[PDB]
PDB file of C-alpha atoms and ligand atoms in Angstrom:
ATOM      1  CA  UNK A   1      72.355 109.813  79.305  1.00 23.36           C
ATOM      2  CA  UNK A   2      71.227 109.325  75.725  1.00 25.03           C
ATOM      3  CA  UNK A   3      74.437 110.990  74.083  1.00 24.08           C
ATOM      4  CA  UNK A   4      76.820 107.779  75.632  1.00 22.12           C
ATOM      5  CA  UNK A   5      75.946 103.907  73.954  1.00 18.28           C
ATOM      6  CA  UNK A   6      77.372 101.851  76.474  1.00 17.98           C
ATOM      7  CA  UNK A   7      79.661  98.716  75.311  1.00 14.51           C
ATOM      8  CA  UNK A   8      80.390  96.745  78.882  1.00 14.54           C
ATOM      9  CA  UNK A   9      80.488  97.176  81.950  1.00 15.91           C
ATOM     10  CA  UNK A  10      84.341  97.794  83.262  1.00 17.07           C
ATOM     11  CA  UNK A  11      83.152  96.739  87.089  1.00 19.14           C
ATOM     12  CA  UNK A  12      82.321  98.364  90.334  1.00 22.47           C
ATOM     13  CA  UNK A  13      83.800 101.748  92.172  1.00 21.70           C
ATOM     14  CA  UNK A  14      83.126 103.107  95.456  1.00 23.02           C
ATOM     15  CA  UNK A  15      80.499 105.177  94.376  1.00 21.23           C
ATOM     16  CA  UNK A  16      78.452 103.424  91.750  1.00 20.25           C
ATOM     17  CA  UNK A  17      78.876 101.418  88.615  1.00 21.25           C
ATOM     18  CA  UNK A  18      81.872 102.139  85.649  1.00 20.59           C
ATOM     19  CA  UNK A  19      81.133 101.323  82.280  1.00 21.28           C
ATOM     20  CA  UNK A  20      82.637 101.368  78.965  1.00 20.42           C
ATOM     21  CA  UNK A  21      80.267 103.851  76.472  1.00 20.27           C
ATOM     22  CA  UNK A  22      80.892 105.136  73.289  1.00 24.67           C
ATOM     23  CA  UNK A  23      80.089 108.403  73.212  1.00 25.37           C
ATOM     24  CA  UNK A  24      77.288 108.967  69.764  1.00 22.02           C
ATOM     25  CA  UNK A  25      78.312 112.543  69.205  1.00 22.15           C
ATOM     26  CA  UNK A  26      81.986 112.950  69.286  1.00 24.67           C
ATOM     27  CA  UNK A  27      82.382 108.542  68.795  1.00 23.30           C
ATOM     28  CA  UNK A  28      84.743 108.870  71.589  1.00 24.09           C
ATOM     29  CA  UNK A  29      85.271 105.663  73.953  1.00 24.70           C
ATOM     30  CA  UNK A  30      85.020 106.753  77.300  1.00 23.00           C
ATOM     31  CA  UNK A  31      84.895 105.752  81.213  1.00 25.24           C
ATOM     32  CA  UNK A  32      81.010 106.617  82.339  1.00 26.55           C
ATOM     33  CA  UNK A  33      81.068 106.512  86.315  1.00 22.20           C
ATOM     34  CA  UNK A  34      77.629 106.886  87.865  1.00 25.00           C
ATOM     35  CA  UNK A  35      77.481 108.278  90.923  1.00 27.43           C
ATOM     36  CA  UNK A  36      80.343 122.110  96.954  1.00 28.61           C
ATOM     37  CA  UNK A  37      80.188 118.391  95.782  1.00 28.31           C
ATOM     38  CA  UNK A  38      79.443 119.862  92.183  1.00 30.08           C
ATOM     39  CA  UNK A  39      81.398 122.702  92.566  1.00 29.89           C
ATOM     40  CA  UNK A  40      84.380 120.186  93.857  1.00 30.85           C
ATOM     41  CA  UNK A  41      84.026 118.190  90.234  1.00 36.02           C
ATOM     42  CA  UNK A  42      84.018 121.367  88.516  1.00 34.46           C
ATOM     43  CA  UNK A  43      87.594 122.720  89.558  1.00 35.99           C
ATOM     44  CA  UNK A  44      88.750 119.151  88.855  1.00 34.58           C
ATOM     45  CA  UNK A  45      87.723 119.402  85.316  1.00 34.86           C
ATOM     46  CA  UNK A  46      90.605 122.175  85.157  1.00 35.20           C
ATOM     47  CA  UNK A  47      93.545 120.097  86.632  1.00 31.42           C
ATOM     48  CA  UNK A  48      94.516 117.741  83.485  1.00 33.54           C
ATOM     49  CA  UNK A  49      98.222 116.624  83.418  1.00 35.24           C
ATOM     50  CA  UNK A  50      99.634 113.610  81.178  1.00 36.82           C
ATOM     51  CA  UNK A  51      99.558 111.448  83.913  1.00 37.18           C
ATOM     52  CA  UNK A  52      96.129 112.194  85.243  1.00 37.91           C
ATOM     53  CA  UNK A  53      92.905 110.455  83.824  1.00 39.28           C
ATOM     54  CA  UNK A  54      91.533 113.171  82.140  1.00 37.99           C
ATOM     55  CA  UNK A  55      87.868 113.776  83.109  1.00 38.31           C
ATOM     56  CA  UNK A  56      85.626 114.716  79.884  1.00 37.56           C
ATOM     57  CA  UNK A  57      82.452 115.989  81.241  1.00 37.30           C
ATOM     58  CA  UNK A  58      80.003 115.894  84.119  1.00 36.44           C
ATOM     59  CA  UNK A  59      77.217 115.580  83.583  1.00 36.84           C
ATOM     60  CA  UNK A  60      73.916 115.914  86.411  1.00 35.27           C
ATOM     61  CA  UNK A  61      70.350 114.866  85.807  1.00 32.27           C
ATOM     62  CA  UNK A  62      67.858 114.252  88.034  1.00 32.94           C
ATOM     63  CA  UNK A  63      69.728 114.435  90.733  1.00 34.84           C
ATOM     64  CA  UNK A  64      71.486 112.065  89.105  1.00 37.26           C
ATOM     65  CA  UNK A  65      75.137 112.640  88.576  1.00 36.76           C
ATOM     66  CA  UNK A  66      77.634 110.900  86.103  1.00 36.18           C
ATOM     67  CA  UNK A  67      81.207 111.538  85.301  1.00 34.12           C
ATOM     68  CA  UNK A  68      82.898 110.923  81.826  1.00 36.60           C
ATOM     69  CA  UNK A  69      86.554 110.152  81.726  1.00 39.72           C
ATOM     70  CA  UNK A  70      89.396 109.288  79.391  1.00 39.80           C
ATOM     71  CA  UNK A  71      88.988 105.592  78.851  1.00 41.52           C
ATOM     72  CA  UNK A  72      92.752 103.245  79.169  1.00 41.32           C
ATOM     73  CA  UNK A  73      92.523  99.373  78.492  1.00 43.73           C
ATOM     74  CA  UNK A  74      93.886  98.268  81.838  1.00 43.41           C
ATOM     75  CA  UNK A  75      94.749  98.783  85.567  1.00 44.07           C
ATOM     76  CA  UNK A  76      97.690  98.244  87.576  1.00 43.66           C
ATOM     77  CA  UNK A  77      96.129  95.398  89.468  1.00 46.19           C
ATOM     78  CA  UNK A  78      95.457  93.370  86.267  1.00 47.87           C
ATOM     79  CA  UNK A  79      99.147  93.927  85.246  1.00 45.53           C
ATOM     80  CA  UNK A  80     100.261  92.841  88.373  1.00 45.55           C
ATOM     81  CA  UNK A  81      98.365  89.430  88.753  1.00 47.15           C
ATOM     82  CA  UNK A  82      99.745  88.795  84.742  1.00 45.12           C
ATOM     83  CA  UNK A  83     103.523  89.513  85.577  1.00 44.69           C
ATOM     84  CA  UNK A  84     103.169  87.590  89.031  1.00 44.09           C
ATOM     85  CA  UNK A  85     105.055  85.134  87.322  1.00 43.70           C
ATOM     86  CA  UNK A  86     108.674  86.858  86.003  1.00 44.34           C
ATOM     87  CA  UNK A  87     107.467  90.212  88.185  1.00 45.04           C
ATOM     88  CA  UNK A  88     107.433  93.592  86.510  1.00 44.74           C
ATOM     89  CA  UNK A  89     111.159  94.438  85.122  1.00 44.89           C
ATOM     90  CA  UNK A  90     112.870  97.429  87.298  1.00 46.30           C
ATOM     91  CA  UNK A  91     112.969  99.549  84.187  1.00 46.84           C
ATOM     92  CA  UNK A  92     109.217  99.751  83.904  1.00 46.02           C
ATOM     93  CA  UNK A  93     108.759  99.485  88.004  1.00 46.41           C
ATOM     94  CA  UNK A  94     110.924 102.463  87.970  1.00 43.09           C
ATOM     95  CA  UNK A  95     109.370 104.545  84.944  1.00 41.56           C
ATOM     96  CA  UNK A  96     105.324 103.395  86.263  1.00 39.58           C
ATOM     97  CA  UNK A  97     106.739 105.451  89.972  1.00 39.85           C
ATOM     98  CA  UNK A  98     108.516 107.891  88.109  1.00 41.02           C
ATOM     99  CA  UNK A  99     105.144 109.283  85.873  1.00 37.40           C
ATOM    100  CA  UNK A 100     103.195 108.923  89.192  1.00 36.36           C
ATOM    101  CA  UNK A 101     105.240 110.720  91.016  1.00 34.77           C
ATOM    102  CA  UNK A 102     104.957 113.179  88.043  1.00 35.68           C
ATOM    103  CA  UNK A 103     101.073 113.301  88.543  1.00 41.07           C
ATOM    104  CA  UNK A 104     101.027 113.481  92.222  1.00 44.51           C
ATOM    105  CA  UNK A 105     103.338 116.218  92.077  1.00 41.33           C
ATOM    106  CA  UNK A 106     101.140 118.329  89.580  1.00 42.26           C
ATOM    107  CA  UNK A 107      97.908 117.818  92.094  1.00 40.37           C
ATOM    108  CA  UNK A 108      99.613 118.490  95.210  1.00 41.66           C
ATOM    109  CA  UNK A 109     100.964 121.838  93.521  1.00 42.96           C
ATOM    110  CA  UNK A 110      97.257 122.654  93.119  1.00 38.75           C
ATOM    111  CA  UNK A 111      96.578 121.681  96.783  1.00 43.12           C
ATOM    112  CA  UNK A 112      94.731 118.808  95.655  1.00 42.30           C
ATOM    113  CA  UNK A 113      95.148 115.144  97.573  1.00 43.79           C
ATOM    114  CA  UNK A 114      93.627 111.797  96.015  1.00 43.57           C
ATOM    115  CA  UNK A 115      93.469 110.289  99.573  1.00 42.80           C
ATOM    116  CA  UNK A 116      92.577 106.896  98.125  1.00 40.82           C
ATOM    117  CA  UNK A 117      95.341 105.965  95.827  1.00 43.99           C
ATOM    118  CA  UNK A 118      95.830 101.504  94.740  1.00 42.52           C
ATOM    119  CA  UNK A 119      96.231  99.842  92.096  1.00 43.89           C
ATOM    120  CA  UNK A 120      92.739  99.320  91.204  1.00 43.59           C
ATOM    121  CA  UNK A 121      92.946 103.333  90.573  1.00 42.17           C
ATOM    122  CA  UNK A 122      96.350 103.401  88.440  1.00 41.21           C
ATOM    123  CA  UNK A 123      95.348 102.753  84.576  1.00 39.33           C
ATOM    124  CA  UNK A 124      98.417 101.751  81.855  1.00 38.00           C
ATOM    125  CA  UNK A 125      98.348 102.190  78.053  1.00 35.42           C
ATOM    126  CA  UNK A 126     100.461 100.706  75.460  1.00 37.52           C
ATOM    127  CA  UNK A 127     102.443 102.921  75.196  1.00 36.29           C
ATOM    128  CA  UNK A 128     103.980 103.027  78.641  1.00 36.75           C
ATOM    129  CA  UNK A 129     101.705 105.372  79.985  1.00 38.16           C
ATOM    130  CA  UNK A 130     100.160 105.256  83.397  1.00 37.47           C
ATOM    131  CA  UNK A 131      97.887 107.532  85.523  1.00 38.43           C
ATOM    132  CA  UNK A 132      96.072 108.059  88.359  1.00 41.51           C
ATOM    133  CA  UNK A 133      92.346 108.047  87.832  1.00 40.57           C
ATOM    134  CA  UNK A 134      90.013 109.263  90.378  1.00 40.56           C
ATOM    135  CA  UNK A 135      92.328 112.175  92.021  1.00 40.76           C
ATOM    136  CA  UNK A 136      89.771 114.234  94.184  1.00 40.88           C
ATOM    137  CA  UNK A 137      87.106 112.290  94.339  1.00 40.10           C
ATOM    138  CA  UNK A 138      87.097 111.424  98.118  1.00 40.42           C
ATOM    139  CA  UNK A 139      86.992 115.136  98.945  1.00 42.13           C
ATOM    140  CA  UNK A 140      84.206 115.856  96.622  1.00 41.91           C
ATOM    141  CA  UNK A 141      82.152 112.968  97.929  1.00 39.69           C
ATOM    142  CA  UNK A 142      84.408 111.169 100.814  1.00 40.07           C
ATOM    143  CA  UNK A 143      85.970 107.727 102.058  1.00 38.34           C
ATOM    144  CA  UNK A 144      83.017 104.749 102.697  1.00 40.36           C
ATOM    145  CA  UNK A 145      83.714 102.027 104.849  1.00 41.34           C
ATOM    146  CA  UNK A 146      81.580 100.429 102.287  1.00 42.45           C
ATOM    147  CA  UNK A 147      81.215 100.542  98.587  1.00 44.59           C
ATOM    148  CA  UNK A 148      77.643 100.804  96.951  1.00 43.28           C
ATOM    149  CA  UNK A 149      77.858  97.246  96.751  1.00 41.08           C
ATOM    150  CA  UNK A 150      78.784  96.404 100.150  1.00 40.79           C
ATOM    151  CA  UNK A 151      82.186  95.527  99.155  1.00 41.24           C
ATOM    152  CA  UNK A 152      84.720  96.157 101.616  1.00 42.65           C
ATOM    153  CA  UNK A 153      86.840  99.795 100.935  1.00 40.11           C
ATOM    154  CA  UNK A 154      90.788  98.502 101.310  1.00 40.88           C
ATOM    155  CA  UNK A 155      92.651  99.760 104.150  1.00 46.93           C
ATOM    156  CA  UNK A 156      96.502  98.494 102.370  1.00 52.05           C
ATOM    157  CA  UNK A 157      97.399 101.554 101.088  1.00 52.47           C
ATOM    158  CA  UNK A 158      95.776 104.118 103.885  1.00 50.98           C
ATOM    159  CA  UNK A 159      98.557 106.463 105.748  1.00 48.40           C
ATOM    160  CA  UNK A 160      98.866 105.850 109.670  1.00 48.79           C
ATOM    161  CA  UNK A 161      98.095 109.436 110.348  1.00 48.06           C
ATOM    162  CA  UNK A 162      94.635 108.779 108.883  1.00 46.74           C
ATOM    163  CA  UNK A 163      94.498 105.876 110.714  1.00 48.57           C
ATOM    164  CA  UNK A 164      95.140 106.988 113.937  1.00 48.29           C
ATOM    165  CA  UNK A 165      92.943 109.921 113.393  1.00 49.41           C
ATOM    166  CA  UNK A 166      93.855 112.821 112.150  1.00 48.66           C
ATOM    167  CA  UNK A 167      91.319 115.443 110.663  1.00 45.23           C
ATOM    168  CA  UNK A 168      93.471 117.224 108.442  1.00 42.60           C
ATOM    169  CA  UNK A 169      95.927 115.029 106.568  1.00 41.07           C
ATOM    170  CA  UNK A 170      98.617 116.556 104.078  1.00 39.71           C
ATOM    171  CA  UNK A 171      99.147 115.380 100.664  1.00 39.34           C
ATOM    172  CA  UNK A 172     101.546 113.261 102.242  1.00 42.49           C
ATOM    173  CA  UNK A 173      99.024 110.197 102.693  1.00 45.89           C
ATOM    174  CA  UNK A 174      99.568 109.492  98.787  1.00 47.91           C
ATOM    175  CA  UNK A 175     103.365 109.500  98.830  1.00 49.51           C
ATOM    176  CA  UNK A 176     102.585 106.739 101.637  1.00 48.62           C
ATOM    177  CA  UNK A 177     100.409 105.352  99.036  1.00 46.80           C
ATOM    178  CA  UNK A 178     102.246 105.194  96.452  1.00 46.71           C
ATOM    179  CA  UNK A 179     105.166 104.086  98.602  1.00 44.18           C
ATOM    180  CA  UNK A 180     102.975 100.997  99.672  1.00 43.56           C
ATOM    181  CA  UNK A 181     102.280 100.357  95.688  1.00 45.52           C
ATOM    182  CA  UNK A 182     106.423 100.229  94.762  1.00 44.11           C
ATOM    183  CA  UNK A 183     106.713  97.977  97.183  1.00 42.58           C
ATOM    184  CA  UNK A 184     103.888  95.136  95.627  1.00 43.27           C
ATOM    185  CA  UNK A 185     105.194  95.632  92.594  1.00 44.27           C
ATOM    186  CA  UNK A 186     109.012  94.991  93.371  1.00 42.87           C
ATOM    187  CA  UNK A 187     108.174  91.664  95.606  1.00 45.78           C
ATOM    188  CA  UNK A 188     104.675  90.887  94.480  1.00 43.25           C
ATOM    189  CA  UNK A 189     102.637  90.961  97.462  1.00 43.85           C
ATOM    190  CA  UNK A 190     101.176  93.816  99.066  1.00 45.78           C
ATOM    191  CA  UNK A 191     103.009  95.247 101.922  1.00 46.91           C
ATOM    192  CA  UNK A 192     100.457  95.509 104.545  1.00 47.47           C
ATOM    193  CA  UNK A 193      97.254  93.418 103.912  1.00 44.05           C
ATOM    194  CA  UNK A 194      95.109  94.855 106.813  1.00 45.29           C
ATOM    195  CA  UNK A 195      91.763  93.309 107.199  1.00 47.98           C
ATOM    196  CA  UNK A 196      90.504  95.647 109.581  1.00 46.44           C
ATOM    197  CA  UNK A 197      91.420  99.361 111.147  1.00 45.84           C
ATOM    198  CA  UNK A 198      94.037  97.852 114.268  1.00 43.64           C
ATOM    199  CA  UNK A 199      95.192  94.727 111.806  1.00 43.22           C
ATOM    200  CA  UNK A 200      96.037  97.955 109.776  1.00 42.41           C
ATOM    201  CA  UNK A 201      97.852  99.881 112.351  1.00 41.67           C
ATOM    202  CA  UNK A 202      99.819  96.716 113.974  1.00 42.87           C
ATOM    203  CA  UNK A 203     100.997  95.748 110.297  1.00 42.93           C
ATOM    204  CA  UNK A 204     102.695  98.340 110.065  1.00 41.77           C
ATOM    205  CA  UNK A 205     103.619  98.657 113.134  1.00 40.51           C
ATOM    206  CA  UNK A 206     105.279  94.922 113.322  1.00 38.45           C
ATOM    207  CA  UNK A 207     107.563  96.003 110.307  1.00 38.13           C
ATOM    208  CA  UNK A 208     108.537  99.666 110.512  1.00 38.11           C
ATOM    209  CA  UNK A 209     108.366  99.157 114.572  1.00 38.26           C
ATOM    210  CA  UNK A 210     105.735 101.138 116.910  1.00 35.35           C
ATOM    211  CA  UNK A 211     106.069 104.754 116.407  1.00 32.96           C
ATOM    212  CA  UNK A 212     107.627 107.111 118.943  1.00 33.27           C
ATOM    213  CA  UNK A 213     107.956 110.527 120.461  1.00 33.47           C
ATOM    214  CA  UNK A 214     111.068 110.192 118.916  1.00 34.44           C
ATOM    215  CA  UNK A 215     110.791 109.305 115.252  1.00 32.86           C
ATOM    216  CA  UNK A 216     107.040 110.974 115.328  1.00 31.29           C
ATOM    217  CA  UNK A 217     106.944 114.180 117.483  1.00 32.94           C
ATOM    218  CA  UNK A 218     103.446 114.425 118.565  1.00 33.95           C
ATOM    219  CA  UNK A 219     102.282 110.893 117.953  1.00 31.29           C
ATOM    220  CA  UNK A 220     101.322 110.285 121.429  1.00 30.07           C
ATOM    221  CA  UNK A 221      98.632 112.683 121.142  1.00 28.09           C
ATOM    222  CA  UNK A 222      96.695 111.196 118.261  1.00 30.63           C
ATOM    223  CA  UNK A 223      93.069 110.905 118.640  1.00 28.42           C
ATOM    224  CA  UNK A 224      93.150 107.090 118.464  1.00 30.00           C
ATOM    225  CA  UNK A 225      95.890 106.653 119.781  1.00 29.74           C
ATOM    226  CA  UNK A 226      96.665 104.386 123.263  1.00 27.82           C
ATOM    227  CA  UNK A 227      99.574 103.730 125.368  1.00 28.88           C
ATOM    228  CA  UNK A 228      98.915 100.795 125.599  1.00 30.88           C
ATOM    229  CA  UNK A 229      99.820  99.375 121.689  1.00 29.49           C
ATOM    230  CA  UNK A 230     102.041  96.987 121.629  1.00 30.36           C
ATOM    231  CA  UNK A 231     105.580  97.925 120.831  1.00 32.14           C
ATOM    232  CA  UNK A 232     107.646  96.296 118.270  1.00 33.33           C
ATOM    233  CA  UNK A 233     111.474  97.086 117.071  1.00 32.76           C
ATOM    234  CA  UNK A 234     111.176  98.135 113.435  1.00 30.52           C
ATOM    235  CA  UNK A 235     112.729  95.795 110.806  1.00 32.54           C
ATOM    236  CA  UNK A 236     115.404  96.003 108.457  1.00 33.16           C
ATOM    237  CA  UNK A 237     114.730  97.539 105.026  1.00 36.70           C
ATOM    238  CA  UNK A 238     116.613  94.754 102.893  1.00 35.07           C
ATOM    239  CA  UNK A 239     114.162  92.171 104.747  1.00 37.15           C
ATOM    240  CA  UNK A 240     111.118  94.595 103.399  1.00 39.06           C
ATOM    241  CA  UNK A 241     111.483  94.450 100.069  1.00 39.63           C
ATOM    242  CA  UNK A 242     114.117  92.413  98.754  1.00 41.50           C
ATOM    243  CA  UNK A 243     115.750  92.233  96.007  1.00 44.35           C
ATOM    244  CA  UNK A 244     115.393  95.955  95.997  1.00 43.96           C
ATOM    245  CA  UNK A 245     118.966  97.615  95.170  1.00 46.13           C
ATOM    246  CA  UNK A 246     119.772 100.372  97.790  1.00 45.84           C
ATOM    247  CA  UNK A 247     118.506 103.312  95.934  1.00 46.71           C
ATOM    248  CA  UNK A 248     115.471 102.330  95.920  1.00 49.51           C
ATOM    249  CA  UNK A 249     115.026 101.166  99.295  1.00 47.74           C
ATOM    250  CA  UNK A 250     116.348 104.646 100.225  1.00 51.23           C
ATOM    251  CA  UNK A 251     113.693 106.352  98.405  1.00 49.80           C
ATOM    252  CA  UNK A 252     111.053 103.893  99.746  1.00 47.09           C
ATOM    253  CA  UNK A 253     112.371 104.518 103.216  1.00 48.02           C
ATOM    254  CA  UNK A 254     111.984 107.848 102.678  1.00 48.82           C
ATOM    255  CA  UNK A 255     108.449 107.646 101.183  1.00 48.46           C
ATOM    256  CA  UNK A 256     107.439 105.186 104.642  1.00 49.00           C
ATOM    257  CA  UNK A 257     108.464 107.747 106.965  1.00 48.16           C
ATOM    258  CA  UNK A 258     106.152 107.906 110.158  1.00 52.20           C
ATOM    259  CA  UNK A 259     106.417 111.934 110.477  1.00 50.53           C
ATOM    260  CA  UNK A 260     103.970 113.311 107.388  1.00 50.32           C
ATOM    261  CA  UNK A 261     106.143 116.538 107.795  1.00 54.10           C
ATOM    262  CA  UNK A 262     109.689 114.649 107.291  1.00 54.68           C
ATOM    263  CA  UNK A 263     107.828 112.292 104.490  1.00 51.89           C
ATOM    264  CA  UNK A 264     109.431 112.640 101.105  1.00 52.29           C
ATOM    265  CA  UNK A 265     107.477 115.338  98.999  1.00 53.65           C
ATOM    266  CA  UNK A 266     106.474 114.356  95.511  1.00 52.42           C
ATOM    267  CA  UNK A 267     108.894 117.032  93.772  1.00 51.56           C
ATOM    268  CA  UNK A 268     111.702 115.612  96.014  1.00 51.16           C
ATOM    269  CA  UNK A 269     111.314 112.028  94.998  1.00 51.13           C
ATOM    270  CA  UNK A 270     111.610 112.873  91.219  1.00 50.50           C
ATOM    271  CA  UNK A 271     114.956 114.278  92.215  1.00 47.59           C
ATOM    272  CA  UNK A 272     116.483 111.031  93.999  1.00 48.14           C
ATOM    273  CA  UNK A 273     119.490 108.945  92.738  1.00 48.89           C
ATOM    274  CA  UNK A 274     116.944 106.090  91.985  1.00 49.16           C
ATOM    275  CA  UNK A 275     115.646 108.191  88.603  1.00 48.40           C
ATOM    276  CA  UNK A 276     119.229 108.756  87.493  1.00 47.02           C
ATOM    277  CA  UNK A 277     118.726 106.253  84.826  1.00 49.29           C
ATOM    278  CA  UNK A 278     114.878 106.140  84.415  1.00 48.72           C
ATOM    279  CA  UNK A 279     113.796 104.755  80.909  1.00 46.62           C
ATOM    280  CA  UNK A 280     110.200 104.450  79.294  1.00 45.99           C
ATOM    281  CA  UNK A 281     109.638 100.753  78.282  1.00 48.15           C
ATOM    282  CA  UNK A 282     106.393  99.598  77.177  1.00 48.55           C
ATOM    283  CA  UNK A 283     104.178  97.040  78.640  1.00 47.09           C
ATOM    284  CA  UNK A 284     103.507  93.428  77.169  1.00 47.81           C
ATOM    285  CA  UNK A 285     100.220  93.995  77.238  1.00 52.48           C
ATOM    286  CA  UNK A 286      97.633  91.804  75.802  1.00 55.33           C
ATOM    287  CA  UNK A 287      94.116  93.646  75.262  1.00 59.06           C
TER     288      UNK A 287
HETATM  289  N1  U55 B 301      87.993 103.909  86.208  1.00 56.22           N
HETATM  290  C1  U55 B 301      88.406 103.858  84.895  1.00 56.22           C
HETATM  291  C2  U55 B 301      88.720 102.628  84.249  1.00 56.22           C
HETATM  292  C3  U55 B 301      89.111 102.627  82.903  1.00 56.22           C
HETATM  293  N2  U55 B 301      89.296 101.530  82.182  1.00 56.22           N
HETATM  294  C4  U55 B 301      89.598 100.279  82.543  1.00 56.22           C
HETATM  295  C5  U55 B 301      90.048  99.984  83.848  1.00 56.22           C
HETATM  296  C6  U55 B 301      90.270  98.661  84.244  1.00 56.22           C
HETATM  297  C7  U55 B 301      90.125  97.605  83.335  1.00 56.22           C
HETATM  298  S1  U55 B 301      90.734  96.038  83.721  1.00 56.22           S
HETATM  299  N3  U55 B 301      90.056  95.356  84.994  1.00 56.22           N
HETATM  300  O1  U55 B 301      90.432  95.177  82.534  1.00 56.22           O
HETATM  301  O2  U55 B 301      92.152  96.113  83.875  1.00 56.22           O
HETATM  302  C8  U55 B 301      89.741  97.886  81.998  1.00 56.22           C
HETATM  303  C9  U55 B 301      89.498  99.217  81.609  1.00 56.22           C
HETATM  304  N4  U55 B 301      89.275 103.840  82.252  1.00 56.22           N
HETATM  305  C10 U55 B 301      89.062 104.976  82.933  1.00 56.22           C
HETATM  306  N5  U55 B 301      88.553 105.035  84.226  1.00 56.22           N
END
């Protein structure tokens, strides 16, 4: 569009290319992404919360669509690779979960899922903020194996209900989500690194143990599911993320739990012990 002058490109989404643009009118700084789809977009446009990137405009031309969002200076994944040395101090671990619990919350009370949530999609501030950016997309234009570039769409952070699959997943696949992004951020290293749909499943399998009729009433039913996975004993929680203290591995326990119906809700988890003392530092960030 010849409203936006854009200043560099950010990098590459699922859908298309993300650029910084300045926008000639207003002189905002935005996010320009180019990409019942439209009228998806459209009842996004109404959902803004502080902790949800808030999206500007939308704007389709030739059958050519582009979104305009709030623009923040970093994401979570950058921040991450920077503190890799010292970590991320529990105070801002805790208040980063806390807000995005806060956003997730706000959606799901609006029936809306993100479906794709990782750190790649949560963007910080200076001021301590942090948000999830891209909440409804998926729906609007769905999951690719594949990015526009080719690039390979990560499988870390995707529920085992979608993986063994389910056609209509709860809003309980981004508590998983998000429960897989506390985790990197307490110990540094993502919790389960699949490189492939089964590499997925067994990953998690190997640490929170094959799932049964037992702890998952109706598992053995799934579509792809097969008797004959392998089964492993689960693993103990202070061997998952340690140095974790034992509120928080209680609330990640409860955010990892196989059963999407028993999973912690978003309202719920705002409400554990862990938050009793919840703070809101800033980030050392360098722009
Ligand atoms: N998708 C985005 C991104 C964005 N900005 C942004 C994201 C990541 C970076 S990075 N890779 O420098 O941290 C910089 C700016 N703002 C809004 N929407």
């Amino acid at each position: 569009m010849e409203n936006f002058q854009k200043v560099e490109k950010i990098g590459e989404g699922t859908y298309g290319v993300v650029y910084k643009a300045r926008n000639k009118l207003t002189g905002e700084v935005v996010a320009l992404k180019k990409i019942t789809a439209i009228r998806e977009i459209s009842l996004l446009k109404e959902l803004n919360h502080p902790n949800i990137v808030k999206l500007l405009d939308v704007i389709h031309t030739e059958n050519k669509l582009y979104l305009v969002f709030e623009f923040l200076h970093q994401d979570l994944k950058k921040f991450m690779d920077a503190s890799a040395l010292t970590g991320i101090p529990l105070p801002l671990i805790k208040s980063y979960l806390f807000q995005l619990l806060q956003g997730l919350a706000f959606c799901h009370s609006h029936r809306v899922l993100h479906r794709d949530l990782k750190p790649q999609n949560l963007l910080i501030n200076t001021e301590g903020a942090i948000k999830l950016a891209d909440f409804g997309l998926a729906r609007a234009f769905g999951v690719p194996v594949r990015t526009y570039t080719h690039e390979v769409v990560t499988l870390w952070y995707r529920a085992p209900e979608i993986l063994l699959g389910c056609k209509y997943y709860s809003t309980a696949v981004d508590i998983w989500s998000l429960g897989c992004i506390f985790a990197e951020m307490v110990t540094r290293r993502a919790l389960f690194p699949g490189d492939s749909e089964i590499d997925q499943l067994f990953r998690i399998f190997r640490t929170l143990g094959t799932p049964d009729e037992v702890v998952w009433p109706g598992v053995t039913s799934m579509p792809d599911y097969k008797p004959s996975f392998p089964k492993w004993a689960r693993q103990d929680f202070s061997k998952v993320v340690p140095p974790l203290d034992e509120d928080g591995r209680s609330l990640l326990s409860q955010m990892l739990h196989y059963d999407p119906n028993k999973r912690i809700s978003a309202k719920a988890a705002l409400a554990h012990p862990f938050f009793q003392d919840v703070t809101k530092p800033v980030p050392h960030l360098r722009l």
